[PDB]
Amino acid sequence: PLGSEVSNPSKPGRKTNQLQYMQNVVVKTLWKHQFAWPFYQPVDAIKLNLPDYHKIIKNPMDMGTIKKRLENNYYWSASECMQDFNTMFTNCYIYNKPTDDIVLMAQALEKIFLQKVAQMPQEEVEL
Amino acid sequence: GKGKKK
Numbered sequence: 001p002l003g004s005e006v007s008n009p010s011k012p013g014r015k016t017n018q019l020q021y022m023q024n025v026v027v028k029t030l031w032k033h034q035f036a037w038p039f040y041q042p043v044d045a046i047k048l049n050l051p052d053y054h055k056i057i058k059n060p061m062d063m064g065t066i067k068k069r070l071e072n073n074y075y076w077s078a079s080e081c082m083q084d085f086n087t088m089f090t091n092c093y094i095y096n097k098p099t100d101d102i103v104l105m106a107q108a109l110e111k112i113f114l115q116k117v118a119q120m121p122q123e124e125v126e127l
Numbered sequence: 128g129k130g131k132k133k
């Protein structure tokens with residue numbers, strides 16, 4: 001937006017193995033889950049009509065926002081993405097009731113998340 | 128929307 005960025009030259013944003021890994025491996029596969037479809041759209045607040053979302057939920061994020069910072073090389077490595085990825089899941093659990101479809105989906109979505117994360121390069125290699 | 132997207 002006009003203020004907070006998704007890409008910035010002065011701000012470090014190198015390409016490491018972990019970074020490129022989670023981008024194409026983790027979130028892109030999370031994306032391919034047919035239950036991850038309600039997370040295909042970022043919280044624009046207006047588009048999805050979520051005005052009080054920005055009041056209750058701390059960091060209104062999803063999967064399109066995470067991948068946006070990833071493809072724009074916002075961080076240095078995927079370790080920084082572990083923050084936004086973590087919030088996207090909790091956000092759904094908090095705003096939505098545990099009996100909601102989106103919650104039921106998020107629970108299953110989380111499986112492939114940790115699945116690919118456990119297989120992450122535990123050493124890291126800057127490209 | 129938010130509320131059972133089935």
